[PDB]
Ligand binder design. Structure first.
Ligand SMILES: NC[C@@H](O)c1ccc(O)c(O)c1
Ligand SMILES: [Fe+3]
Length: 308
C-alpha cells in the first residue's frame, strides 16, 4: 500500500532512524580506513546529524588544521576551472558565496551560514546527514526544498579523491546551483514526483537525478557547460566532460530514466538540458505518468504537502 511520505517539513526528522548504519568509512578500501582518529571524527559528525532536529541552528564545528588543508587543496585546484567550464548560474553566484559565506581556501564554511544564505535566495535549506539515506528519503526532502548535506571531509591522504559525498562536494558542487531560482524549482519537482511513488519509479527518478543534478550539462547558446555537482567537484571529469570524448544526448526523460551508469569511472555519456525551466517541465510531465492514486502540492506558506 502507498508507501509513507512526510507531509510537513518537520516530519523529515523521521529519516535519521532510517539510514545505512555501516558507513563507507568502515570499508577496507576507504582512504581513511586504517586511521582511528579519522574514524572517530566521522562518528562525531554522525552524532551531530543524528541529533539534529528541524528548526534548530546546525551545530558549528571547529575543523582541524589537517582538514582545512584538504579543503584548501580541493578549492584551489577546482576554482581555476569554473570560469571556463561551469554553467552561467554557477559563476553568477560564486562571488557572492566568497563574500558572504566565507568560501575561501583557508576556511571551511559552516553549514548554518550557507543554509541561511540559501534560504534568502530560494528558500532551500540544508540539514546535516549522518550516512546514506535511501533514494526515497533523500529525494523526498527536495519536495520541501531541503537538501540533506554531509558535514565531514574526505581523508587527507587523497585530497583529490572521495568515494562518497563529503563537504567539498556539497559546497563546491551542489550549493551554488541551489541558489538559482529555476534550478531550485526544477530540483523540487523531482522531489514532489517521488512522494508515495512505487519503488521501481523511485529508481527511475534517482537515475534522472544522477544525470541532471549530479552529472548534467547545460546548453548555453551554442556552447555546452557543466552544472552537475559530481562534475563541478571532480577536477578530472570536469575537464573531460567538455572534450570530444564523451557522447552527448538531449535530455529525454523516458530515455534518461532507464539509462545505466557506473559510479567508478568517468561517464561515457551525458545528457544536455536546454535550461532548468525546461528540465522542470519535463520532470512534471514524467511525474504524471507515475502511478499514484493522488496528486501532491507543496504550500510554502505552511510548509505542508497537500494531497489531492
Ligand atoms: N543516492 C546515491 C548517493 O551516493 C548520492 C545521492 C545524492 C548525491 O547528491 C550524491 O552526491 C550521492
Ligand atoms: Fe551529490
Amino acid at each position: 500500500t502507498v508507501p509513507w511520505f512526510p507531509r510537513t517539513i518537520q516530519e523529515l526528522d523521521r529519516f535519521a532512524n532510517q539510514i545505512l548504519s555501516y558507513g563507507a568509512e568502515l570499508d577496507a578500501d576507504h582512504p581513511g580506513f586504517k586511521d582511528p582518529v579519522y574514524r572517530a571524527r566521522r562518528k562525531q559528525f554522525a552524532d551531530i546529524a543524528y541529533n539534529y532536529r528541524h528548526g534548530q541552528p546546525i551545530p558549528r564545528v571547529e575543523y582541524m588544521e589537517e582538514e582545512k588543508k584538504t579543503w584548501g587543496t580541493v578549492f584551489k585546484t577546482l576554482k581555476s576551472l569554473y570560469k571556463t567550464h561551469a554553467c552561467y548560474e554557477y559563476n553568477h553566484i560564486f562571488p557572492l558565496l566568497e563574500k558572504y559565506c566565507g568560501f575561501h581556501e583557508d576556511n571551511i564554511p559552516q553549514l548554518e551560514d550557507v543554509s541561511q544564505f540559501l534560504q534568502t535566495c530560494t528558500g532551500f535549506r540544508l540539514r546535516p546527514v549522518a550516512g546514506l539515506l535511501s533514494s526515497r528519503d533523500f529525494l523526498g526532502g527536495l519536495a520541501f526544498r531541503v537538501f540533506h548535506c554531509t558535514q565531514y571531509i574526505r581523508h587527507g591522504s587523497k585530497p583529490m579523491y572521495t568515494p562518497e559525498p563529503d563537504i567539498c562536494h556539497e559546497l563546491l558542487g551542489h550549493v551554488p546551483l541551489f541558489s538559482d531560482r529555476s534550478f531550485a524549482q526544477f530540483s523540487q519537482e523531482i522531489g514532489l514526483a517521488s512522494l508515495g511513488a512505487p519503488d521501481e519509479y523511485i529508481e527511475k527518478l534517482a537515475t534522472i537525478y544522477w544525470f541532471t543534478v549530479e552529472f548534467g550539462l547545460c546548453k548555453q547558446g551554442d556552447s555546452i557547460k557543466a552544472y552537475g555537482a559530481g562534475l563541478l567537484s571532480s577536477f578530472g571529469e570536469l575537464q573531460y566532460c567538455l572534450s570530444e570524448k564523451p557522447k552527448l544526448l538531449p535530455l529525454e526523460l523516458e530515455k534518461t530514466a532507464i539509462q545505466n551508469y557506473t559510479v567508478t569511472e568517468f561517464q561515457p555519456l551525458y545528457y544536455v538540458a536546454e535550461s532548468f525551466n525546461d528540465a522542470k517541465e519535463k520532470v512534471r510531465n514524467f511525474a504524471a505518468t507515475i502511478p499514484r492514486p493522488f496528486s501532491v502540492r507543496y504550500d510554502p506558506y505552511t510548509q505542508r504537502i497537500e494531497v489531492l
